[PDB]
Ligand binder design. Structure first.
Ligand code: HEM
Length: 396
């Protein structure tokens, strides 16, 4: 009755078979995952999952305090984080960083992102073919950008990601690691944010720390946590989707030619890769059903833990015809790669912009770009809630 879900599948970017089976055959299923007390529902259908993310009957505020079935021994979340608030209390702090990424603002920052990318490739060319696209592009760019954004000193950055990542370990014994790593992170911002509030720079932490509706909207905890949360998120998913997309383009010659034939297809192609590419293992933060809510003919009692799978949502044949096929031409329908509902991804805008400025430069600069080894020789991360390539040797 209750499925085992270690969610350990890692083979290339192949869609987790357990997930494909639960989509087609038990689109609402009882499950139990690596760590946490109790069990939880798993909703896998587009429309059903859309329901769960938006319908005020399901709270993420209600998760505060539960040993919720999750994939990391220590939960990645914190108390005062945007992740454990719903609208309305979310909408005020979301509201504030959302100013920072209006298309005017993000289509300004482009300028600098173009100069970062250019320099990163002006360096990879200098060290000469072959090279690691992960080391020389996919890893640095997202980290530079979010640090530039937050005015993070150059010396702290390699440190800060090697803590960000440590919190994303699914490893039983890397839990003390995680709780210390997390608290050291909290602390560093606790201070460096209280150092902006104090002598506001003209960066983004300053934008958060200085905004005042009469009396500063953000409390110090509320801020330090928001500056800490913006750093973590600004440098995992994006670094990974830069490797994932690269791999996919260098292993689907038809796709990669089509783009080289008509580069204008790129913003449409990226959406379709985004949809497809299963850019994580398992399921992230759940929600609690606040009241009984039947959902695909299955009552969910009040106080039950609900997970949604964004990855099965994207591959729902009810929404996308030939869903497993990767058609950048297909009738555009909103993907759920960037989340949905209240907690939809806050940095969608900026990762959009990084992915556009990256692959559009790559494509022109290195038309000849090819994977330098066979695809099955590429090693895929196993230790993370995310899926990404460890290295991506390329020629040009
Ligand atoms: C390809 C790039 C990215 C992907 C695929 C991605 C994906 C996601 C996803 C799937 C969620 C799901 C939250 C949920 O539904 O429960 C999320 C939340 C979030 N992402 Fe991202 N993200 C990306 C880039 C970024 C960037 C650059 C930032 C930069 C600040 C960012 C900040 C956030 C934040 C703050 C949340 C939490 C919002 C909330 O729960 O209220 N993301 N992201």
């Amino acid at each position: 009755t209750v499925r085992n879900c270690p969610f350990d599948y890692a083979h290339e970017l192949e869609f987790d078979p357990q997930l494909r089976q639960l989509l087609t055959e038990e689109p609402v299923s009882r499950i139990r995952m690596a760590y946490g007390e109790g069990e939880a529902w798993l909703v896998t259908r587009y429309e059903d999952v859309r329901t769960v993310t938006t319908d005020r009957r399901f709270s993420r505020s209600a998760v505060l305090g539960r040993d919720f079935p999750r994939m990391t021994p220590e939960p990645i979340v914190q108390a005062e984080s945007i992740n454990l608030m719903d609208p309305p209390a979310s909408s005020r702090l979301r509201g504030l960083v959302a100013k920072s990424f209006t298309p005017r603002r993000v289509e300004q920052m482009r300028g600098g992102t173009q100069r970062v990318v250019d320099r990163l490739l002006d360096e990879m060319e200098e060290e000469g073919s072959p090279a690691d696209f992960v080391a020389r592009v996919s890893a640095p760019l997202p980290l530079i950008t979010i640090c530039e954004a937050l005015d993070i000193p150059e010396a702290d950055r390699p440190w800060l990601r090697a803590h960000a990542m440590t919190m994303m370990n699914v490893g039983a014994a890397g839990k003390q690691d995680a709780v210390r790593a997390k608290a050291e992170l909290r602390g560093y911002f606790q201070e460096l944010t209280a150092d902006r509030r104090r002598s506001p720079g003209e960066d983004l932490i300053s934008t958060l720390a200085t905004a005042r509706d009469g009396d500063e909207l953000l409390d110090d905890d509320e801020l330090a946590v928001m500056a800490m949360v913006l750093l973590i998120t600004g440098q995992d998913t994006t670094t990974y989707q830069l490797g994932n997309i690269a791999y996919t383009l260098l292993t689907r010659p038809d796709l990669l030619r089509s783009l080289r034939a008509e580069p204008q297809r790129l913003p449409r192609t990226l959406e379709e890769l985004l949809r497809h590419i299963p850019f994580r293992k398992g399921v992230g933060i759940p929600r609690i059903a606040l009241e009984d809510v039947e959902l695909s003919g299955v009552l969910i009692k009040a106080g039950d833990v609900v997970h949604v799978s964004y990855l099965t949502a994207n591959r729902d044949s009810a929404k996308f015809d030939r869903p497993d096929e990767l058609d950048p031409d297909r009738p555009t329908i909103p993907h759920m790669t960037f989340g949905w509902g209240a907690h939809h991804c806050l940095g969608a805008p900026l990762a959009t912009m990084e992915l556009e400025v990256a692959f559009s430069t790559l494509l022109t600069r290195f038309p000849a770009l090819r994977l330098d080894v066979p695809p099955e020789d590429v090693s895929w991360n196993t230790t993370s809630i995310w899926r990404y390539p460890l290295a991506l040797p390329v020629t040009w």
